[PDB]
Amino acid sequence: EVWVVGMGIVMSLIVLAIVFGNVLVITAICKFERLQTVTNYFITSLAVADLVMGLAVVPFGAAHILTKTWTFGNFWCEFWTSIDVLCVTASIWTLCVIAVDRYFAICSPFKYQSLLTKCKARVIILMVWIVSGLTSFLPIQMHWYRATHQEAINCYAEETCCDFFTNQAYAIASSIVSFYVPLVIMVFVYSRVFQEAKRQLQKIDKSEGRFHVQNVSQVEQDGRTGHGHRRSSKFACKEHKALKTLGIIMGTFTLCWLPFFIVNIVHVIQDNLIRKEVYILLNWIGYVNSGFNPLIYSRSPDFRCAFQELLA
């Protein structure tokens, strides 16, 4: 009915958001605007993972929903599904990696500079993609996931029918690796980081000079800012960075991802408890997570400038 147009428009906005956002954040190693920082590379990976989402996966999916059939063909259906899983795994995993990065901010007089990670951040990125690919493309192409079912066999063999069917064995490991583990790591990580923030502010509260000169007042200190940043600004950026990242990770996970990934287990454990509509909608919900990051995730001060300059 009305739904077709209504859905199409939304799909358009999402497809637009993911592409515009990811592309804006990164395209290729080349731009020189202070963004080069090593920590930034991880978000770059995030950006790339999300970019592919809006390019291949989400628009084909949208068209898929519009057509109510798969026009793409069998082999391409396989390709598309593979890219989908790869994108999701890469996204979630990357987010967890970032979480690890922030967690590593244990602080202390020495820890960051000495270790310099086990080796290189790049290896972490490659590992993420490699594990993501191994969990996706290899299993899919191999037909490891295919569960022998009459309907499954029929749809798979059929070139045009592109429907997602997976054996329980594939689903538990797939979901656990893709979503669950990173969820646990992030939960513990952000949790500890939160504790750290709390501690620092408390300690600061404990600290207090005797007999203040009188009082100080400030409202904006212009935008240019000057004179000094003091460590206050350090708390500024550390707490705000922690706050935005944590808010973004939890918000992405919950507004898009958790309901989907859990539902997977739900469908696997109990067979006729769920509708197919829920599966797709939830999956899209997860898709939106790719889109939000560039708007939110790239809050860093350098990022904002650099972004605005592009728009002007």
CSV table of C-alpha atoms in Angstrom, one decimal:
chain,number,residue,atom,x,y,z
A,1,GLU,CA,0.0,0.0,0.0
A,2,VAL,CA,1.4,3.3,1.3
A,3,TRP,CA,4.3,1.3,2.7
A,4,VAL,CA,6.2,0.9,-0.5
A,5,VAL,CA,6.8,4.6,-1.0
A,6,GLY,CA,7.1,5.1,2.8
A,7,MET,CA,9.8,2.5,3.0
A,8,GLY,CA,11.6,3.7,-0.2
A,9,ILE,CA,12.0,7.2,1.2
A,10,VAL,CA,13.5,5.9,4.5
A,11,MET,CA,15.8,3.6,2.6
A,12,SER,CA,16.9,6.6,0.6
A,13,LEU,CA,17.7,8.5,3.7
A,14,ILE,CA,19.7,5.7,5.3
A,15,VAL,CA,21.5,4.9,2.1
A,16,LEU,CA,22.4,8.5,1.8
A,17,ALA,CA,23.5,8.9,5.4
A,18,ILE,CA,25.8,5.9,5.4
A,19,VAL,CA,27.6,6.9,2.2
A,20,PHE,CA,27.8,10.6,2.8
A,21,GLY,CA,29.0,10.1,6.4
A,22,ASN,CA,31.5,7.4,5.8
A,23,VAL,CA,32.8,9.0,2.7
A,24,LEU,CA,33.2,12.3,4.5
A,25,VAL,CA,35.1,10.7,7.3
A,26,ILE,CA,37.5,8.9,5.0
A,27,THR,CA,38.1,7.8,1.4
A,28,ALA,CA,41.7,6.9,1.1
A,29,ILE,CA,45.0,7.5,2.9
A,30,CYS,CA,46.0,10.9,1.4
A,31,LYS,CA,44.4,13.8,3.2
A,32,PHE,CA,46.8,15.7,5.6
A,33,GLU,CA,44.9,17.6,8.3
A,34,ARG,CA,46.3,16.3,11.6
A,35,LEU,CA,43.8,13.4,11.3
A,36,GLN,CA,46.8,11.1,10.6
A,37,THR,CA,47.2,10.2,14.3
A,38,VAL,CA,47.6,6.5,14.9
A,39,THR,CA,44.5,6.3,17.0
A,40,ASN,CA,42.6,7.7,14.1
A,41,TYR,CA,43.5,4.8,11.9
A,42,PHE,CA,41.2,2.5,13.8
A,43,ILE,CA,38.2,4.8,13.2
A,44,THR,CA,39.4,4.9,9.6
A,45,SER,CA,38.8,1.2,9.5
A,46,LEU,CA,35.5,1.8,11.1
A,47,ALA,CA,34.7,4.3,8.4
A,48,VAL,CA,35.7,1.9,5.6
A,49,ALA,CA,33.7,-1.0,7.1
A,50,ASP,CA,30.6,1.3,7.3
A,51,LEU,CA,31.1,2.7,3.9
A,52,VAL,CA,30.8,-0.7,2.2
A,53,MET,CA,27.7,-1.1,4.2
A,54,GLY,CA,25.8,1.8,2.6
A,55,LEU,CA,27.3,1.1,-0.8
A,56,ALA,CA,26.8,-2.5,-1.6
A,57,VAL,CA,24.8,-4.1,1.2
A,58,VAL,CA,22.2,-1.5,2.2
A,59,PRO,CA,21.1,-0.3,-1.2
A,60,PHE,CA,20.9,-3.8,-2.7
A,61,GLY,CA,18.9,-4.8,0.4
A,62,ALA,CA,16.6,-1.8,-0.1
A,63,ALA,CA,16.0,-2.7,-3.7
A,64,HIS,CA,15.5,-6.2,-2.5
A,65,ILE,CA,12.7,-5.1,-0.2
A,66,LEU,CA,11.2,-3.0,-2.9
A,67,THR,CA,11.2,-5.7,-5.6
A,68,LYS,CA,10.0,-8.4,-3.2
A,69,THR,CA,12.4,-10.6,-5.2
A,70,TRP,CA,16.1,-11.0,-5.9
A,71,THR,CA,16.9,-9.8,-9.4
A,72,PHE,CA,20.7,-10.0,-8.8
A,73,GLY,CA,21.1,-13.7,-9.5
A,74,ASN,CA,22.5,-16.6,-7.6
A,75,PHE,CA,26.2,-16.0,-7.6
A,76,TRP,CA,25.7,-12.3,-6.9
A,77,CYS,CA,23.3,-13.2,-4.2
A,78,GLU,CA,26.1,-15.2,-2.6
A,79,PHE,CA,28.5,-12.3,-3.1
A,80,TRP,CA,26.0,-9.8,-1.6
A,81,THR,CA,25.3,-11.9,1.4
A,82,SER,CA,29.0,-12.4,2.0
A,83,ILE,CA,29.7,-8.7,1.9
A,84,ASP,CA,26.8,-8.2,4.3
A,85,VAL,CA,28.2,-10.5,6.9
A,86,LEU,CA,31.7,-9.1,6.4
A,87,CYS,CA,30.5,-5.6,6.9
A,88,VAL,CA,28.7,-6.4,10.0
A,89,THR,CA,31.5,-8.3,11.6
A,90,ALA,CA,34.0,-5.6,10.6
A,91,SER,CA,31.8,-2.9,12.0
A,92,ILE,CA,31.1,-4.5,15.4
A,93,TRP,CA,34.6,-5.8,15.8
A,94,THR,CA,36.1,-2.4,14.9
A,95,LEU,CA,34.0,-0.8,17.5
A,96,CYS,CA,35.3,-3.2,20.1
A,97,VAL,CA,38.8,-2.5,19.0
A,98,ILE,CA,38.3,1.2,19.6
A,99,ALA,CA,36.8,0.4,22.9
A,100,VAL,CA,40.0,-1.5,23.6
A,101,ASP,CA,42.0,1.5,22.5
A,102,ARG,CA,40.3,3.8,25.0
A,103,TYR,CA,40.5,1.2,27.7
A,104,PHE,CA,44.2,1.1,27.2
A,105,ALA,CA,44.1,4.6,28.4
A,106,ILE,CA,44.8,3.2,31.8
A,107,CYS,CA,46.8,6.4,32.3
A,108,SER,CA,49.6,6.2,34.9
A,109,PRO,CA,53.0,7.8,34.5
A,110,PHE,CA,54.1,5.0,32.1
A,111,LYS,CA,52.2,2.5,30.0
A,112,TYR,CA,51.1,4.1,26.8
A,113,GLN,CA,54.5,5.2,25.4
A,114,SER,CA,56.5,2.2,26.4
A,115,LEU,CA,54.4,-0.6,25.1
A,116,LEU,CA,53.2,0.9,21.9
A,117,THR,CA,50.8,-1.9,21.6
A,118,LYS,CA,52.2,-5.4,21.0
A,119,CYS,CA,53.3,-4.3,17.6
A,120,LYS,CA,51.3,-2.1,15.3
A,121,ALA,CA,47.8,-0.7,15.1
A,122,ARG,CA,47.7,-1.7,11.5
A,123,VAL,CA,48.1,-5.3,12.4
A,124,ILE,CA,45.0,-5.0,14.6
A,125,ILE,CA,43.0,-3.6,11.7
A,126,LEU,CA,44.2,-6.4,9.4
A,127,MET,CA,43.4,-8.9,12.0
A,128,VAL,CA,39.9,-7.5,12.4
A,129,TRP,CA,39.3,-7.7,8.7
A,130,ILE,CA,40.9,-11.1,8.3
A,131,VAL,CA,38.9,-12.6,11.1
A,132,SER,CA,35.8,-10.9,9.7
A,133,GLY,CA,36.4,-12.3,6.3
A,134,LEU,CA,37.2,-15.8,7.6
A,135,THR,CA,33.9,-15.8,9.5
A,136,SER,CA,32.0,-14.6,6.5
A,137,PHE,CA,33.3,-15.1,3.0
A,138,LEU,CA,35.0,-18.4,3.5
A,139,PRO,CA,32.1,-20.0,5.2
A,140,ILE,CA,29.5,-18.6,2.8
A,141,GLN,CA,31.3,-19.4,-0.4
A,142,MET,CA,32.0,-22.9,1.0
A,143,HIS,CA,28.3,-23.4,1.7
A,144,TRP,CA,29.2,-24.3,5.3
A,145,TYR,CA,26.2,-22.3,6.5
A,146,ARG,CA,23.8,-23.9,4.2
A,147,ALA,CA,21.5,-26.1,6.2
A,148,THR,CA,20.1,-29.0,4.3
A,149,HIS,CA,16.4,-28.2,4.1
A,150,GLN,CA,14.0,-28.7,1.3
A,151,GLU,CA,13.1,-25.0,1.3
A,152,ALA,CA,16.7,-24.0,1.9
A,153,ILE,CA,17.9,-26.2,-0.9
A,154,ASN,CA,15.2,-24.9,-3.2
A,155,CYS,CA,15.9,-21.2,-2.6
A,156,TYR,CA,19.6,-21.6,-2.7
A,157,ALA,CA,19.6,-23.6,-5.9
A,158,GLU,CA,17.2,-21.1,-7.3
A,159,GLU,CA,19.1,-18.2,-8.8
A,160,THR,CA,16.5,-15.5,-8.1
A,161,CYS,CA,15.4,-16.5,-4.6
A,162,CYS,CA,17.8,-14.8,-2.3
A,163,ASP,CA,16.8,-15.7,1.3
A,164,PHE,CA,18.9,-16.0,4.4
A,165,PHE,CA,18.9,-19.5,5.9
A,166,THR,CA,21.5,-20.7,8.3
A,167,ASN,CA,22.1,-23.9,10.3
A,168,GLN,CA,22.1,-23.6,14.1
A,169,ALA,CA,25.8,-24.4,14.2
A,170,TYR,CA,26.6,-21.5,11.9
A,171,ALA,CA,24.4,-19.1,13.8
A,172,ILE,CA,25.7,-19.7,17.3
A,173,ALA,CA,29.3,-19.3,16.4
A,174,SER,CA,28.7,-16.6,13.8
A,175,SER,CA,26.7,-14.5,16.2
A,176,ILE,CA,28.9,-15.0,19.1
A,177,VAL,CA,32.0,-14.1,17.2
A,178,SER,CA,30.4,-11.2,15.3
A,179,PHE,CA,28.4,-9.5,18.0
A,180,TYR,CA,28.5,-11.2,21.4
A,181,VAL,CA,32.2,-11.3,22.2
A,182,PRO,CA,32.8,-7.8,21.3
A,183,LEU,CA,29.8,-6.8,23.3
A,184,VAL,CA,31.2,-8.4,26.5
A,185,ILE,CA,34.6,-6.9,26.0
A,186,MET,CA,33.2,-3.5,25.4
A,187,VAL,CA,30.9,-3.8,28.4
A,188,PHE,CA,33.8,-4.6,30.8
A,189,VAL,CA,36.0,-2.0,29.1
A,190,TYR,CA,33.8,1.0,29.1
A,191,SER,CA,32.7,-0.1,32.6
A,192,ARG,CA,36.3,0.2,33.9
A,193,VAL,CA,36.9,3.3,32.0
A,194,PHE,CA,33.8,4.8,33.6
A,195,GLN,CA,35.1,3.9,36.9
A,196,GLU,CA,38.3,5.7,36.1
A,197,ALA,CA,36.5,8.9,35.1
A,198,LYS,CA,34.5,8.8,38.3
A,199,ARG,CA,37.7,8.3,40.3
A,200,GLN,CA,39.5,11.2,38.7
A,201,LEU,CA,36.7,13.6,39.3
A,202,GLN,CA,36.3,12.5,42.8
A,203,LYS,CA,40.0,12.9,43.5
A,204,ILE,CA,39.8,16.3,42.0
A,205,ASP,CA,36.8,17.1,44.2
A,206,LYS,CA,38.9,16.1,47.2
A,207,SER,CA,41.6,18.4,46.0
A,208,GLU,CA,40.8,22.0,46.9
A,209,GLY,CA,43.1,25.0,47.6
A,210,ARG,CA,42.6,26.7,50.9
A,211,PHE,CA,41.2,30.1,50.9
A,212,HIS,CA,40.4,30.7,47.2
A,213,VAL,CA,41.4,34.1,45.9
A,214,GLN,CA,37.7,34.7,45.7
A,215,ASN,CA,36.1,33.2,42.7
A,216,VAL,CA,36.3,32.9,39.0
A,217,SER,CA,33.6,33.0,36.4
A,218,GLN,CA,33.5,31.8,32.8
A,219,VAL,CA,30.9,31.2,30.3
A,220,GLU,CA,32.6,30.4,27.0
A,221,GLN,CA,36.1,31.8,26.9
A,222,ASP,CA,35.3,32.6,23.3
A,223,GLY,CA,35.8,29.9,20.7
A,224,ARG,CA,39.4,30.7,19.8
A,225,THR,CA,40.3,30.2,23.4
A,226,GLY,CA,43.7,31.1,24.6
A,227,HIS,CA,46.0,31.9,27.4
A,228,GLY,CA,46.0,28.3,28.5
A,229,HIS,CA,44.1,25.1,28.4
A,230,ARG,CA,45.1,23.9,31.8
A,231,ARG,CA,44.5,20.3,32.6
A,232,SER,CA,40.8,21.2,32.8
A,233,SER,CA,40.7,21.0,29.1
A,234,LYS,CA,42.4,17.6,29.4
A,235,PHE,CA,39.5,16.5,31.6
A,236,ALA,CA,37.3,18.2,29.0
A,237,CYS,CA,38.4,16.0,26.2
A,238,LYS,CA,39.1,12.9,28.2
A,239,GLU,CA,35.7,12.8,29.9
A,240,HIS,CA,33.8,14.0,26.8
A,241,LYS,CA,35.7,11.6,24.6
A,242,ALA,CA,34.9,8.8,27.0
A,243,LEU,CA,31.3,9.9,27.2
A,244,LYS,CA,30.7,10.2,23.5
A,245,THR,CA,32.4,7.0,22.6
A,246,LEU,CA,30.6,5.1,25.3
A,247,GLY,CA,27.3,6.7,24.4
A,248,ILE,CA,27.9,5.9,20.7
A,249,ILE,CA,28.9,2.4,21.3
A,250,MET,CA,26.1,1.5,23.6
A,251,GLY,CA,23.6,3.5,21.6
A,252,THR,CA,24.7,1.8,18.3
A,253,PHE,CA,24.6,-1.6,19.9
A,254,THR,CA,21.2,-1.2,21.5
A,255,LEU,CA,19.4,0.9,19.0
A,256,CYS,CA,20.8,-1.3,16.3
A,257,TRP,CA,22.3,-4.7,16.6
A,258,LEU,CA,21.4,-6.3,20.0
A,259,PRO,CA,17.8,-6.9,19.1
A,260,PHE,CA,18.9,-8.5,15.8
A,261,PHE,CA,21.7,-10.6,17.1
A,262,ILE,CA,19.8,-11.9,20.0
A,263,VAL,CA,16.8,-12.7,17.8
A,264,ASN,CA,19.1,-14.8,15.8
A,265,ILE,CA,19.7,-17.0,18.8
A,266,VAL,CA,15.9,-16.8,19.4
A,267,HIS,CA,15.2,-18.2,16.0
A,268,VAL,CA,17.8,-20.8,16.4
A,269,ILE,CA,16.7,-22.0,19.8
A,270,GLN,CA,13.0,-21.8,19.2
A,271,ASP,CA,11.6,-22.3,15.7
A,272,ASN,CA,8.3,-20.6,15.3
A,273,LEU,CA,8.6,-17.8,17.9
A,274,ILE,CA,9.6,-15.1,15.5
A,275,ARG,CA,8.2,-13.5,12.4
A,276,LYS,CA,10.4,-12.9,9.3
A,277,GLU,CA,9.5,-9.3,9.2
A,278,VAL,CA,11.2,-8.8,12.5
A,279,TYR,CA,14.4,-10.3,11.2
A,280,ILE,CA,14.7,-7.9,8.3
A,281,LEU,CA,13.7,-4.8,10.2
A,282,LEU,CA,16.1,-5.6,13.0
A,283,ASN,CA,18.8,-6.2,10.6
A,284,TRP,CA,18.2,-2.8,9.0
A,285,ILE,CA,18.2,-1.3,12.5
A,286,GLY,CA,21.6,-2.6,12.8
A,287,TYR,CA,22.5,-1.2,9.5
A,288,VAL,CA,21.8,2.3,10.7
A,289,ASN,CA,24.6,2.0,13.2
A,290,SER,CA,27.0,2.4,10.3
A,291,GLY,CA,25.4,5.7,9.4
A,292,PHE,CA,25.4,7.5,12.8
A,293,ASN,CA,29.1,7.2,13.5
A,294,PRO,CA,30.3,9.9,11.2
A,295,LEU,CA,27.8,12.3,12.6
A,296,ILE,CA,28.6,11.3,16.2
A,297,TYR,CA,31.8,9.3,16.3
A,298,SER,CA,34.0,12.0,14.7
A,299,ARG,CA,33.5,14.5,17.4
A,300,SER,CA,37.2,15.0,17.9
A,301,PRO,CA,38.1,18.6,17.6
A,302,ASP,CA,40.3,18.2,14.6
A,303,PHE,CA,37.7,16.1,13.0
A,304,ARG,CA,35.0,18.7,13.3
A,305,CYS,CA,37.0,21.5,11.8
A,306,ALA,CA,38.2,19.3,9.1
A,307,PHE,CA,34.7,18.2,8.3
A,308,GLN,CA,33.2,21.7,8.2
A,309,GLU,CA,35.9,22.9,5.9
A,310,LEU,CA,34.8,20.3,3.4
A,311,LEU,CA,31.2,21.4,3.6
A,312,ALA,CA,31.9,25.1,3.2
